[PDB]
Every structure is written in C-alpha cells, then in structure tokens.
Design a protein around this ligand. Sequence first.
Ligand SMILES: O=S(=O)(O)c1ccc(/N=N/c2ccc(/N=N/c3c(O)c(S(=O)(=O)O)cc4cc(S(=O)(=O)O)ccc34)c(S(=O)(=O)O)c2)cc1
Ligand SMILES: O=S(=O)(O)c1ccc(/N=N/c2ccc(/N=N/c3c(O)c(S(=O)(=O)O)cc4cc(S(=O)(=O)O)ccc34)c(S(=O)(=O)O)c2)cc1
Ligand SMILES: O=S(=O)(O)c1ccc(/N=N/c2ccc(/N=N/c3c(O)c(S(=O)(=O)O)cc4cc(S(=O)(=O)O)ccc34)c(S(=O)(=O)O)c2)cc1
Ligand SMILES: O=S(=O)(O)c1ccc(/N=N/c2ccc(/N=N/c3c(O)c(S(=O)(=O)O)cc4cc(S(=O)(=O)O)ccc34)c(S(=O)(=O)O)c2)cc1
Ligand SMILES: O=S(=O)(O)c1ccc(/N=N\c2ccc(/N=N/c3c(O)c(S(=O)(=O)O)cc4cc(S(=O)(=O)O)ccc34)c(S(=O)(=O)O)c2)cc1
Ligand SMILES: O=C1c2ccccc2C(=O)c2c(Nc3ccccc3)cc(S(=O)(=O)O)cc21
Ligand SMILES: [K+]
Ligand SMILES: [K+]
Ligand SMILES: [K+]
Ligand SMILES: [K+]
Ligand SMILES: [K+]
Ligand SMILES: [K+]
Ligand SMILES: [K+]
Ligand SMILES: [K+]
Lengths: 494, 493, 398, 400
Amino acid sequence: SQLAHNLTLSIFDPVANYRAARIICTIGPSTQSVEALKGLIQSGMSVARMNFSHGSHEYHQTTINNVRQAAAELGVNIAIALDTKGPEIRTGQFVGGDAVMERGATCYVTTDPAFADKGTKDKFYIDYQNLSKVVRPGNYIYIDDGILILQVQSHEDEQTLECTVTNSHTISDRRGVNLPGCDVDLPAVSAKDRVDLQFGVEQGVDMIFASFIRSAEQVGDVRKALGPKGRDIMIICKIENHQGVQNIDSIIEESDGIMVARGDLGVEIPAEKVVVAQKILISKCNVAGKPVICATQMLESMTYNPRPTRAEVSDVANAVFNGADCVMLSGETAKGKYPNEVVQYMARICLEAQSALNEYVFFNSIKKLQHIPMSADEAVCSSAVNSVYETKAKAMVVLSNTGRSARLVAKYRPNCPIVCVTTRLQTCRQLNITQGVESVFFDADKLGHDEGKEHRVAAGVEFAKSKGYVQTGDYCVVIHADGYANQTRILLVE
Amino acid sequence: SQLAHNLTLSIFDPVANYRAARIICTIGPSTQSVEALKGLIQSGMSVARMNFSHGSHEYHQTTINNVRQAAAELGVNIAIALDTKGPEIRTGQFVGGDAVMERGATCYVTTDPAFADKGTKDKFYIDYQNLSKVVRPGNYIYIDDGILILQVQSHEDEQTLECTVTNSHTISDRRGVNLPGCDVDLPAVSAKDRVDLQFGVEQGVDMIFASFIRSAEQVGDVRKALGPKGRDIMIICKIENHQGVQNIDSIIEESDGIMVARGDLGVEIPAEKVVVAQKILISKCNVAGKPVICATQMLESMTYNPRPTRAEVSDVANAVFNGADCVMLSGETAKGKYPNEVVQYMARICLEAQSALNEYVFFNSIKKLQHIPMSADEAVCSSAVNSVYETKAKAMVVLSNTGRSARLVAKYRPNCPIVCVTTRLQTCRQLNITQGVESVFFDADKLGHDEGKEHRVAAGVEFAKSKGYVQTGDYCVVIHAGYANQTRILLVE
Amino acid sequence: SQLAHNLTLSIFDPVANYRAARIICTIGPSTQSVEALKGLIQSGMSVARMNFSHGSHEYHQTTINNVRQAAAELGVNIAIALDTKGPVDLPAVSAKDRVDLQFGVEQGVDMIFASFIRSAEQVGDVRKALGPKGRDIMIICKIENHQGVQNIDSIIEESDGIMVARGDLGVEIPAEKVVVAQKILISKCNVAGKPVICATQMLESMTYNPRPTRAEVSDVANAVFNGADCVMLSGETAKGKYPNEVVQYMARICLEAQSALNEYVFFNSIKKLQHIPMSADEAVCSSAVNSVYETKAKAMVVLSNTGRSARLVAKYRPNCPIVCVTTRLQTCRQLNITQGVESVFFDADKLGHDEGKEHRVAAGVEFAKSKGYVQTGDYCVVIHADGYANQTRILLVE
Amino acid sequence: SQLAHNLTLSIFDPVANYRAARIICTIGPSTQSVEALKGLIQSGMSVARMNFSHGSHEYHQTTINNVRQAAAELGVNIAIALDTKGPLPAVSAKDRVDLQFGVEQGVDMIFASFIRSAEQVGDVRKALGPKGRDIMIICKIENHQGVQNIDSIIEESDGIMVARGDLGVEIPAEKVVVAQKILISKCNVAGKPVICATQMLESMTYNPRPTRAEVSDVANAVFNGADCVMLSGETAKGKYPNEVVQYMARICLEAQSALNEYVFFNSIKKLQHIPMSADEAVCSSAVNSVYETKAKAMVVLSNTGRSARLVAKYRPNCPIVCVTTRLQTCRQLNITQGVESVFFDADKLGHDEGKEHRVAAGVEFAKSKGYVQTGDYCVVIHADHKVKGYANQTRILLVE
Ligand SMILES: O=S(=O)(O)c1ccc(/N=N/c2ccc(/N=N/c3c(O)c(S(=O)(=O)O)cc4cc(S(=O)(=O)O)ccc34)c(S(=O)(=O)O)c2)cc1
Ligand SMILES: O=S(=O)(O)c1ccc(/N=N/c2ccc(/N=N/c3c(O)c(S(=O)(=O)O)cc4cc(S(=O)(=O)O)ccc34)c(S(=O)(=O)O)c2)cc1
Ligand SMILES: O=S(=O)(O)c1ccc(/N=N/c2ccc(/N=N/c3c(O)c(S(=O)(=O)O)cc4cc(S(=O)(=O)O)ccc34)c(S(=O)(=O)O)c2)cc1
Ligand SMILES: O=S(=O)(O)c1ccc(/N=N/c2ccc(/N=N/c3c(O)c(S(=O)(=O)O)cc4cc(S(=O)(=O)O)ccc34)c(S(=O)(=O)O)c2)cc1
Ligand SMILES: O=S(=O)(O)c1ccc(/N=N\c2ccc(/N=N/c3c(O)c(S(=O)(=O)O)cc4cc(S(=O)(=O)O)ccc34)c(S(=O)(=O)O)c2)cc1
Ligand SMILES: O=C1c2ccccc2C(=O)c2c(Nc3ccccc3)cc(S(=O)(=O)O)cc21
Ligand SMILES: [K+]
Ligand SMILES: [K+]
Ligand SMILES: [K+]
Ligand SMILES: [K+]
Ligand SMILES: [K+]
Ligand SMILES: [K+]
Ligand SMILES: [K+]
Ligand SMILES: [K+]
C-alpha cells in the first residue's frame, strides 16, 4: 500500500535511475530557435506543443522544421502536438473601446448582430447566437476570464436578456464569455480549426490537442475533419467545462487520450472541485489505458521568477501521485525567462515523486477491476507486469508496431523501465505521452522484417544495457502481442 | 482502492454531511477580540494558536481570556495551543543597521561576542557559540530566511570562519541563520521557552507546539520543563530540519503528536523533498495513532487577497489526502484581511477533499500493519471500525475519559462520524486535533458517576441524532475501552 | 490453508486437549442398563439415540429413565433423541409416527430424527405431529434417497438440522456419488449454521471385532474433515460386543482429526459467503470469532438462553473451545449436537436473574479455568446476543 | 474455497470428460497374460507394478515383455515399475541384483522399499549405476523413521509412496490417516509424484463389490491430492481384475468433479518465496492464465518432463498435454496427475528447433480428445532448467 510504502521512505536516499512521467513544452518566442529547442530536449522535453490560438501557419511551420532539426541533431524522437484554438464565445465592441460595469446595475445582453460595434454599459453584443435558448433566469454569465459575473433575470425578448451586475469590473473590447451550468452547443471544430487541422495532416503532426470537447459525437467530428489521411493521428480531448466532465466516459471511449485543463475548468467550476475532477479524469484514463495530461497553471510563477512557490511544487508532485502520464508547461516555456530551468526543475519534481510512488498499488488496483474471463491481450500484459514483480526484473521489452500493446503494458505500471521496439517512427513519437516507456526504432527497410523476432528483442535488451537498467544475470520480461498471436519470455540477460 | 473510488465520484453530487479534518487558527490583531473569535469559531476554528515568538504575556492572556469567553457564549469547547519561540541562531548587529553583501566578495563570520554590536560586511557575529565545531569547509550558511547564501572556505581561527558570498543580498540587524545539513546542538528549550511554558501551565493550556525539535531526548526536556502540574498537556513536536526528519521515529514515540512545518523545512531542504517528507511524517503518525498537523504556507496569498491561487487550494486538499488530522492557518488569521473567509474556504476545501477520500484504504493499510497477536485495545478498536464497514453503520459512540481510546478508534478511519463521550472538559478540547471526532461532555459531578455507562451511551446517541448522523433503523457501533472493554452494535430507536 | 497446515503437522506431537466433534450412540440390549450408560457417557457419549423401529413404548421409557439417572449420577447433561420408524409418494409421518411423537413430547425428548424426509412440506408434518406442546423440540431430518438430496435447500431451511444416512442413500445411489453427497450436505449445513450428523456404516465391523478396519477409521476422520458436527453409532452400541471400546476409539479418531484440521479455513470460507451489509447478529458472532484468531484467545464464553447465538458462534469455527452459559437445561442437552461447544447451566431460580450478566460470565470463565483452557494472562472472548441486544468483551483472565 | 465449491455441486450432473488421477496395477497370476494386460489398460491402468518379493527374473521378464506387447498393440505408453523386496542397510544383496536387472531391461521407475533416511536414497541410486541415471526413485514410506525424515527423503527422491498398511503395523490407524495428509501435501509443494498404496479396494479381491468405506478411502486419497492410487492383490491374485480398475477410475473421476483445483493452485502459489526463479515464475503464471482466461487445455513442451511436472504441481482446471521427444518421458509422466503425453518422433519428423510443429501436435491432440474446439483458449508453455538459462516461452493461443 502507498501508506506502508511511505513508512520505508527516506528523502536522503538517491533517486530512481529513471524518470517515468513525460514533459510537454509549449513552443514560443523564448524557445522556437533550433539552439533553444536543443536546450529544451536536454532539459527533458518529450513533446513540443504548438498553440494555434496565436501565430500564422508560417510561425508554426518554423516550429515544426526547427523541432525536427533539433531532434535529428541530437538523435532523438520528439512528438509534435497541434493545440487547436477551438470555438469561442466572445462579446462585441464598445463605444470608446470601454465599458464600466458597476455592482447593482442592470444591463442587457443581446445576440442581435446590430449591436456588435456600438455596445455600451447598458446594452452589448455576445456572438453566441443560441444564448437565449440555452440560458434561463437564475443562470450566470461570466465575462473576461470570469472576473465579471452577471445574473440573468428574464427574457426581454427572443434575442435580449435582462441581467444584474453582481460585481464591479471594467471590460474592454471582445472579452471571452463563459456559461457555467449551461449546455453550450457550438460546433466541435471552428472554421479556423478545419484549416489548421488540414495543415496538421499535411505537415504530419503526431497528435491533436482538441479544444473544448463536450461530447462523444464531437470526437467523431474532429476525426472526420482529419479525414482518411489523418486516421493515425492521435486525438487528445481537452476537458474545459461541466459537459466534458459529465460526458467523460464516452469521450474517453472515442478519444486517444485526455487533457485535464485545470485553468479553463477553474473559470466555471470552483477550484476545490477542479482538484477532485483532476483525480477522477486521471484515474478513468488509467483504467482505460490512454494517456492523460495535467495541463495549465503548473509552475506559472517560474515564468519570470528563478524558482516557483512551494505550493506549485506540490501541485506538480501530486499530479504524478494521482497517476498522470504527462505534465504540461504553457507560458513558462513559450514566453518565459527561465525555459531550461523550469523544465529541469519539473523533471526533478517528477523524479522525486516517482521515488515516493508505490507502483504496485496502481498495478494491483487496475488488475482488480478486470472482468474475468479476460481476453488474450489483457491477460498477457497483466501477467507480464506481474512477472516483473515476482522475479524482480529490471526491465521490460515490448515489441509493438503501432504502440497499442506498449500502452497496454504501461497501463499495468511495472516498477521498471519499459522498452518498446517498433518499426514505425510515428510510434516512437506518439509514445512520448505514455509514461514509463522509451522507444527503439528498428529500421525494417535496412535490417529486414525480423519475422523470427530475435533481432528486435536483442535491440531492446541492448538499449536497456546501454541505459544501465539491466546487466548480466538480471531478468527482463519480453512480450509480443499484435486471430491475435502473442508471446511472453522471462529472459536471462547475457 | 482509491483509484477505484475515484471512478465512482461526481463533482456534482452533494458533499458529505460532516468534515473530519480540524482547523487551527493563529490569533493576532485581526482576530483577538471576542467578536472576531466568535466569527472564527462559526467559520470553523477548533484550535486557537498563540505565537509566542511575538507579544507579551499580557497580550496572550487577553487571547486566552477572549477565547474562553467567546467559546462560553457559543456553548462550545475550543482548544488553546502555545507555540514556543524556541532556540535560534541569529546574526549580530551592523554598523549603520545595515550590511550590503555583494556576489563573489569575501567575508568573515565570528563567534566572538565583542563583535555583536559592531559588525560590518567584511566581518560580523553569529550567536551560535559552537558554530566552528559543527561547520566544516564546503558547508553553507543561510542568512535572512535563506535568502543570503554563504559558503565556508576555512577556519580563520577557533572563532572565525572565512566565507564566500555566493549571492547578492543586503541584510539588516539580527537576522536568522540556518545551517543546512549540520547538526545544531542548541538546547531543547531557551530561556524564554522556560518562562513561557510555565505561563502555559499556570493558564491551563491544552497543548504545546514545541519548536525546532531535533531528537527524542529533547521531547523529555520539554516534558520536564512543563513539570508535574502540566503532565496532562500534550506536546506536539514541530519538525523543522533534517535532524527532526532523521530522528522522526524516536520523536513520535516520545511525543503526543507532530507538526509538519513545511516553510521551516523548505529553508534548508529542497521543496520537492519537503513534499515527500510531508507524506512520510503524516503516514508515520497515522500508524502511531497520534495527531499530525500540516502547517505553514497553507492559504498564504489569502492574507491580503479575497481568494487564493489554484495551487494553494490543491495543497490544502492533498494535505487531507496525505492523511493529516489538522490544517493550520498562521498570518492569514493573525494579521490577515479576510480571517472569516479563509477559515470558511479552508473548511470548504477540507469537506470537498473528504468527499473524494476513500477511508477504507486508510483502515485497511493500518490494520495490515498490525502484529498478530494484537493486544486487547488494538483488537477491540480495529474490530469496532471493521463492524462499521460491514454493517454500514452511520455513527460511532466511544466512551473515553482521557481520549486515549477515542484517538485509537479514529486511527482506524471509519467512514462515519465518531462521537466521544467524556467526563473531562480538557478531553473535549484536546480531541480537537484528532480528525473525525466530536466530543460530548458528561458532567459526572452534576449527573452522577454512571458506572452502568447507559447514560453516557444515551447522551452520545442523542447527539448523533440531533446532527442527523443516525435515525431510527440505523446502526451505531458503541464502544467502551485493566483492560476493560465492550463493543455493541446498537440499533437506533 | 489446509495444505499449509498439513506441512507443519507431526503425528508424534501430543494431541489436542479438547474434542470438538460430538458422538451419538444408539441404545439397545447391550447398553440399556444404568451401569452400561455410565460407561457410554464416560467413553464420550453426548447424545443417546432411541430407534423406534423396534421395541415398545415401555422399552424406550426405560431408556429415557436410565439415561437421566446415569447422567444425574455423573453430574452431566445428556440429550435424548427419538429416531422414528417412518414409511416416491408415501406420507411424511405414518400412523405409528404420530403416536410415537406424542409420546416423545410427553416424555420431554430433546430432538427428533425424522426418517425418510424428501421435501420441506414433510418437515411441517412432523411439526404439527409434535403439536403446540413440542414447539421447542429440534427436528433433524434424515436424508435417505435422491429426493432428499434434490430438495436439500428447502429441507435445511425448514429443519433444525440434517442427518446423512450413507447406508440408506447407498441403496439407490452409487457409493462414489454418496461420498460427494455427504460433502454437499455437510457444507450446506455449515453455511446454514445447523447441526449435521454423519450416520450409518461408521465403525460397523467393530460390532463383533475388537478393532475396525483401517478404511473405517479414515471414514470417521474424513467426516470430521468434511466439517460434520456429529458422528453416530448404530448397532455398534445397540447390539455390539465392545460398546465402551468403540466409543472410546471413535473419540480418539475425532480428537486426532481435529488436531490435523485447520479451523481457520472454515472460518474464512463461511465469512466470505456473507452478504454485505451483514445484520447485527451475523456481524457480532463473526467478529468475535475473528477476534479469537487475532489475539490468540484460548476460550470463548457465550451467554445464550435458547442456544441460538451459541450455534451462530460455533458456525464460524474458532480455534478454541466455546463455553455456553445458559439458564435452561434443555439448551444444555440440545447443544450436544453442536461441535466445539460445552454447556454450563445457570440456575436462575436459585441464583437470581443476573441482568448485570456478571455472574453468568464469571461462571463461564470459571468452567474454562477448571477445564484448563485458560489461565491467568490468557485472553477470553465474551459474547452476549439476544431489537436484538448484543455485547462483546475481550477479557483478560485473572 | 472447497466449502463454497461443495454448495454448487450436483450428484446428478454429468461427470468430467477427463480423469486426472492415475492408476497403478500389480501384475500377478490373474494378469500376466497379454490378454489380461490389455483388459487392465482399457480399464484404466497407467503403470504396471512388478513385486520382486516373489517370482524369478524369468517371471518378471514375461511381465515386462507382455506389458510392452499389450501396450504396443493398443497404441499407448505404459510405465513399468520395479518394487524391490528390501531387507539394517538400504538395499539388500538381492536388491542390488534386481536393480541391475531392471536397468538392463529398461524399467521406468523403482518403488524402493523400507526407506528410512535420505542417505539410503543415494544407495539405491548407486545400485542403478551410470546406466540407471534416468530411472525415477520412488521411496516407500513404511515406518516412523521414514515419516520423521520425510523432508530430506523427498528432497533426495523422485517421489513418495504412502504405504498405509505397513505404517499401520506400529503406528495407530488414526495417525496413519494424518500421516497420509502430511506426506501427500509435502509432495504437492515439492511437485514430486505421490502414490496412495495398500488397502484401497481390498475386499474386491474376491467380492464383486467393495465396502462403502473403501470407496470413500479412494476418494479422499484424491481429495488429499494424491497423483496416484495403487492396486495390489486386487489385480495380482484377484477374481475381478478389470472390474476393480474400472471402478477405481469411476471413483477417481467422481472425486475430481467434486475437487476444487483452484484451492490447490492458490495454496502452493502462496507458499512461493519472492523473488522466484524464471522457470518457477513461468509455470505458475501459465496456470494462472488458464484460470483468468478460462482456457480449456495446456500444452507443455518438455523432453525430460521436468516442466510438465512443474506445471502439474500448480493444478490447473484443464488437461495438460505434454509434447516430448522421449518415449520414456511418456511412460514416467504416467505417475503425474492431470498430464497426457504425446510422443514427437524427432528422427522421423525432424528436431523442430522453432517448436512450431510440436505446438501444433499438442493442440491437434487436445482437439482430437475434444478438450478444445475453435474459439477456445489454449496455454502453450515451454520452460527449460537453470542449466539452459531458464529458456522459456508462453503463448495464450486461440484455437482454430
Ligand atoms: O497615542 S497613544 O499613546 O495612545 C498609542 C495608541 C496606539 C498605540 N498602538 N500601539 C501598538 C503597539 C503594538 C502593535 N503591534 N505591534 C506588533 C505588530 O503589529 C506585529 S505584526 O506586524 O502584526 O507582525 C508584531 C509585533 C511583534 C512584537 S514582539 O515580537 O513581541 O517584539 C511586538 C509588537 C508587534 C500595534 S498594532 O496592532 O500593529 O497597530 C499598536 C500606541 C500608543
Ligand atoms: O485498497 S484497499 O486498501 O481499499 C483494500 C480493499 C480490499 C482488500 N481486500 N482484500 C482481500 C482479502 C481477502 C480476500 N479473500 N480471500 C479469500 C477468498 O476470497 C476466498 S473465496 O473462496 O474465493 O471466497 C477464500 C479464502 C481462503 C483463505 S484460507 O482459508 O485462509 O486459506 C484466505 C483468503 C480467502 C479478498 S477477495 O474476496 O478474494 O477479493 C480480498 C484489501 C485492500
Ligand atoms: O479459497 S482459495 O484458496 O481458493 C482462495 C481464493 C482466492 C483468494 N484470494 N484472496 C485474495 C484476493 C485479493 C487480495 N488482495 N488484496 C489487495 C491488496 O493487497 C491490495 S495492495 O495494493 O497490495 O495494498 C489492494 C487491493 C485492492 C482491492 S479492491 O480494489 O478494493 O478490489 C482488493 C484487494 C486488494 C488478497 S490479500 O489481501 O493480499 O490477501 C487475497 C485466496 C484464496
Ligand atoms: O558428443 S559429445 O560428447 O561432444 C556431447 C555433446 C553434447 C552433450 N550434451 N548433452 C546434453 C546434456 C545435457 C542436456 N540438458 N540437460 C538437462 C536438461 O535438459 C534439463 S530440462 O529441465 O529438460 O531443461 C534439466 C537438467 C538438469 C540437470 S541438474 O538438475 O543440474 O542435474 C542437468 C541437466 C539437465 C542436454 S539438452 O539438449 O539440453 O537436453 C544435452 C553431451 C555429449
Ligand atoms: O498570450 S500570448 O503570448 O499569446 C499574447 C497574446 C496577445 C498579445 N498581444 N499582442 C500581441 C503580442 C504579440 C504579437 N506577436 N508577436 C510576435 C513575435 O514576438 C514574434 S517573434 O518570434 O518574437 O519575433 C513572431 C510573431 C509572428 C507572428 S505571425 O507572423 O502572425 O505568425 C505574430 C506575432 C509574432 C502580436 S501580433 O498581432 O502578431 O503582432 C500581438 C501578446 C501575446
Ligand atoms: O532426462 C534425461 C535424464 C534424466 C536423468 C538422468 C539421466 C538422463 C539422461 O541421461 C538423458 C539423456 N541421456 C542420453 C540420451 C542418449 C544418449 C546418451 C545419453 C537424454 C535425454 S533426451 O530427452 O535429450 O533424449 C534425457 C535424459
Ligand atoms: K488553446
Ligand atoms: K481555450
Ligand atoms: K522557528
Ligand atoms: K468519503
Ligand atoms: K429408523
Ligand atoms: K486444530
Ligand atoms: K515390504
Ligand atoms: K473440477
């Protein structure tokens, strides 16, 4: 148990010889150059994130090219992620470019396009056309990152709502508006999204961080927007509101993974409930065997300060204790002052947290939830990880072309590194969001199809030796899984 | 498991009708009046903390008097805690009340008392007389809450050390110094502590927060300092350095509880390791069945702002998930702008976290660690909590005079409230640092000795009904526990 | 596990100081006399069986009278059982049965061995035949054919216990399926918490021989390993040449098997089958037996008037003796078909009602000291369970 | 648990399509002929026992010759066992002569009489010499000394025979029942064959039916966890040779339907020390996979039979099919419960280093017996000894 494991711990013991958790970095003005990216890779970046809320297709082209050049110069594989802007509810414009809202006052929000460029403190535009159909009297309208809170009183007509201003705040032009407790029915992908997703497929991005996902249906729309040529690209759904939290089971089932966007969730949902939401979403992904990213507000104060707050450190640590595959950095790397340091410290926190983490609790909890009889794939992978514990094996070798069984093995959480051997470079990149896994590329073009499998097994073991995980005498659990043929060997290392 | 419990959760389901975690508030200028204290009590204060690092005995007497008066008016029992100043290593004084230290410069730290008042940037005094004996070349000296970092180069003589100024910081008169990774051999109690602890006994405080506890022998020193008159006062040891972490096992055995002073630890130990240290100390206390306090840097930004940061909220919630009995507020309530609001919001976080917490994991882990054969006390209490889970009982009633068996039951973490019925008012107050327990005072002088135990059982069940824990048809596990013991699975009428 | 328990055993070790399984003897010409019954009791007889297939009411009246006299002279309580003659369509009770059962109620018998029970509806026929005056007499159903095996769940639910008649069953059912049937009926009675008797063909060849075959010895032992409350002797004590010797030998086989038997396997198996949430009665007894294992208690003390909670505790199988303190002598006699229990009579008319319960608990602990189960320093688990008032104490013996 | 398993049972339901326990028959005047031997085989004989307490070398030669001819005509493999006369020293002078005769004639196993200590096991081993290395030594436990030194005896031997009758001479019968539980369980942990012998269905030597007590005696031997049950005078000098073996098979099959294998599996798994060596881990993991996927058959590739015995130790709830390139392994596995052997002729078919053909042969056999059909799971396993670096392979195979 985790509690019993805590008793045996010492903060003066040397840390684990390997880091399981993965770090996602947002590329921007601070870190776009080849040299800056090489610093990021060496600091511990596994995935490069492109924020498509800003920048032209040419800015992100520079990022793509530079990421590829930096990784190739260091002989590593780095995943490229496209984070979409997504659909947005925003206000219109104001006369004088400004509107002062005072507590107690009455105002009118309208969806009539006439008021888009002449809004005042009394009446202004909101671009979400179905606003009146979704919102009822009693509901709240949040404006400007939820700083301004309006309470709906009644329908003035079909396009206008009577509202009370509950707090004093001054909103400028085109502020973002949130509708807490309301079922927003905006389309899955925006007009800009369809262009950006097309560009993603063309440039061969590894994964999509799909913004503002609310239902399972919308996951299908993002899939269709990618089309037949983008069928292999992973779709990671960003959960940003109550709808995504409510519909999570079906969302997970249709997606390739989940991002817990704490910041976005915090705007509509109380902070203490977001903490619990993080627990829920991470564990559901853990059982599903799909990557989960802890994102936004991670080491934020380290954007301009040389070190973060003690609370920020525990936040990162607990994301790992919760069971997250990945931890994300947004502005800390994008426009930050200490990009290498923040990644280096994040890696240090993850490594420290992993030393305190009793991996067996995860393994045992996930195995307990399996329905008997298990299918071949499930039984093989859980049994293989069980053999790691029972023989005290120091490494695992998984042969997986698509990375399917690699993620399935990683689900069961062994207390040793997992080495995936694959014939596809895309698999190497895409596994960078799966914890406890490292990828060896086996060039089937240059080295044959290895149908006997011995050459790939040898390539995996070789890597494990070079990294110092195993030596002569140690055990290493080798596993193959593709009418579904499979194999498991407990190998004695030469 | 916790992971399995997580899947069933919903952030839209109503929260628990009960909060297990206990809130400790520091009393200062923002909260010393009778009215302000009643505000705190209603907001969710269970323990009033007095910071004896600042203020006269007349000041803390007012706190004591105002707390008791506030509690009397609301008809509740509030614990009074004395937090000692403790022994300290400080720098001397500087000519012109100032010393600007520049990066790369050389300076000299001396233990020569003649330099106490005439120090400069090139040479100054540090009051720890055994500094040269403990510190070796290569070691670091932190000054002014760890902001100024000096590296020791050589012993200039038997009193003076040559040091390199590794970073630029200007320090004023009498700044606190830290010796990371060095065994500080200062006595357990200072001159001030000795006076202050005697005051605490005379005023009848319930518990002592003893600062800078480094070893088990030092707990005995605080024990001896309190004397025979204060033998029933709890000693909660504050872990602040590496010595406290290394000696934790022997300290816990000798103490009545532990405070995890994250901020103090953070000065000398890397933040990430302090996070892990918190896990170690809390779990160790949980197994020992002794109160553990998560203190310092809890909701610090809410001292001057109406709301805290998201990260601060998760810190408080995870303290509960770690298994802390208590969470503590310092400056937030002592000199803060939103004292009622921060206690209320901390209560909200604790209640929310508790709803997501799987107590059975705690119960099962602790039970698994018990050596068979168990003694009567351990067997009775673990069996009683196990009965709760197996019959889905909605409350527990424990008859405990000293609080001993009450603390032992709470150790096993049932998924229902515990109601302790005690004949001592001091037991009511002292149980305020034990999670998931509420105390009902039974006046033995006014209502008789009740050797049948039926009147005390009735009083406990009646309380559980009035709070809405149990109703007719619900099960309630009644337990009284040399060594006499008794367990009943009661059906509520 | 039993396998793990087997590893640590040694046949050369001194045997256990207490026997859990209970022996029932059939009374005939060889054992009817007062002196002969004194021999049976001392050899280890807990229950005397009357076979109403042979002999008149005056023959069985002598048996009843002599059993009571031999028991009183030795200062012990002995259960008297009435095994009916009995009569597939045939009625439950016959005309002779109804006449014989009325005689049983009048003479105050403790239990009925109802012959040839095939359905639960037939258990009710035996109930009516005993009438309102015999509502507290236990009905032990005798399974004799396939119908009894088929309807066993409903029969157990209605009966007060079961007897497995291997001989009768073996007439229509192959011997190898009877062995399995025995396993089934015993285990179901364990889960039900009702006594089960292993009867017929136990040590038959010891009727005229000084010692039985090895195969017969293993049959007695495996009955105890199956988890039977009672082992029964028919003609071995009724018409047999070595009555005292056969009871002494069966007692030795039971004592030996018990030493090899892992009680914890039984405790854990029955606890795992409990539907959560448990009710108060179920949770109190299982938790008390659990506390025995967790503290290594050397005895239990149960306060039970009807013998209900005494049986419920015995169900969960502690690895120590159970001492039941009861205010009624019929409970003492009726618990003689329950394994691992010993009864202590508490005279309420002579020593007060003891609503504080201290005197009954003290007498229980006293019996455990005199029998040498506990001494100063040992733990003893005390339990009372009658809106269902309950109590549990882990007591330190003075 | 066994108790929970009992509740769900019905005596009127169909029996198992497979028998785990194995039957050993003593050959005598009633059964020496080829015709009477063929009858014994079809009645369920797996091992033919020669009692060297009687008869000359020519008599047992006739037994050896006829057993092989009967088996060859029926197309099955039957083990030949040599039960020594015995005496004190371990082996007698006659034993040494007899053991040499057994080696020459190529017997499969020795039932070594009156074994009292571990030192004596090496004496039997020496009496077999270099050419008798591959012959199993099953130690007969006949007195208190054998019981006392059982741990060291099991460690040195290849198996144990519990001789109840002999033990009953000086030890009380009730303690022999307990002693039976001890030796059987100790062999189960060790994973070495154990035989329940003497006084099985004895009355059926001259009667057409045995007593009900004798039937429960046979059943409880299986419930204890015995690999084998042995017949002496019932098949040696008895009136009903075929009937007694058929009825013993009927009891063994009946007990198997009632027996819960998972209890055995869990008990032995719980007794394993962590960390396990690769071969022990692979074998228990493969059996665990059977339960968790509800596999209907196991296939073990084992030439020596070591991993077959190791897999059988953990008691899966399905047949074990062993594929071996040695006929002597086929014979020797006849004293291990729940295993059936398929001879893969390496000279005729090839050495099959890739193992694909032996796996196919194993599955084919399981299909032909009706253990598996299209859609079922079959657990294929191979596990070499430490000397070969624990070379191992496990497959969860979907049957076509
Ligand atoms: O004109 S009249 O002559 O009538 C007249 C009218 C009003 C007057 N007010 N006088 C006072 C005196 C003290 C005082 N608080 N002081 C402290 C303090 O504030 C803080 S802190 O900042 O919260 O941390 C930490 C302290 C640590 C120590 S120490 O460690 O024991 O040394 C000692 C003191 C303080 C305040 S106030 O409450 O701060 O306003 C007001 C005086 C004269
Ligand atoms: O993560 S948390 O901290 O919250 C947490 C939550 C729950 C936890 N519970 N873990 C357990 C413990 C025991 C257990 N049952 N085992 C047995 C069993 O099941 C059966 S049965 O026949 O198959 O019924 C027969 C047995 C016979 C014996 S023996 O007679 O001594 O050999 C011994 C054992 C069992 C089970 S479970 O019921 O099997 O799932 C689960 C632990 C931690
Ligand atoms: O009668 S037979 O002989 O055939 C027989 C048949 C079945 C038998 N199985 N017995 C068991 C089964 C499970 C088991 N698990 N313990 C758990 C555990 O250890 C951990 S932890 O992570 O390590 O702390 C977390 C758990 C979380 C959950 S859940 O998530 O709440 O479900 C549940 C359990 C555990 C144990 S035992 O407690 O280890 O003894 C014993 C035994 C005998
Ligand atoms: O002609 S030349 O003169 O040059 C010439 C060339 C090669 C020669 N080698 N022939 C051999 C010898 C051994 C051998 N494997 N034996 C073992 C074994 O197989 C297994 S296992 O359980 O089945 O895995 C378990 C063992 C346990 C022990 S022990 O426990 O330590 O006693 C000891 C041995 C084995 C093999 S094989 O091919 O691996 O079968 C082939 C001989 C002569
Ligand atoms: O929170 S956020 O950080 O996102 C944020 C949000 C709102 C902000 N408010 N005003 C801003 C700020 C920056 C900004 N562009 N700076 C750019 C830049 O610095 C560099 S460079 O690499 O450093 O030389 C390359 C760029 C390439 C393109 S592209 O040609 O269109 O691709 C576009 C811009 C930049 C613009 S603007 O409208 O683009 O002129 C407007 C500022 C930041
Ligand atoms: O298991 C074997 C064994 C076990 C215990 C003692 C001795 C042997 C043994 O000698 C032997 C063997 N020897 C051999 C064969 C042919 C020629 C010379 C020697 C060949 C095989 S094979 O399975 O690889 O055929 C298996 C064994
Ligand atoms: K975005
Ligand atoms: K957004
Ligand atoms: K301090
Ligand atoms: K809860
Ligand atoms: K009868
Ligand atoms: K025992
Ligand atoms: K002999
Ligand atoms: K079976």
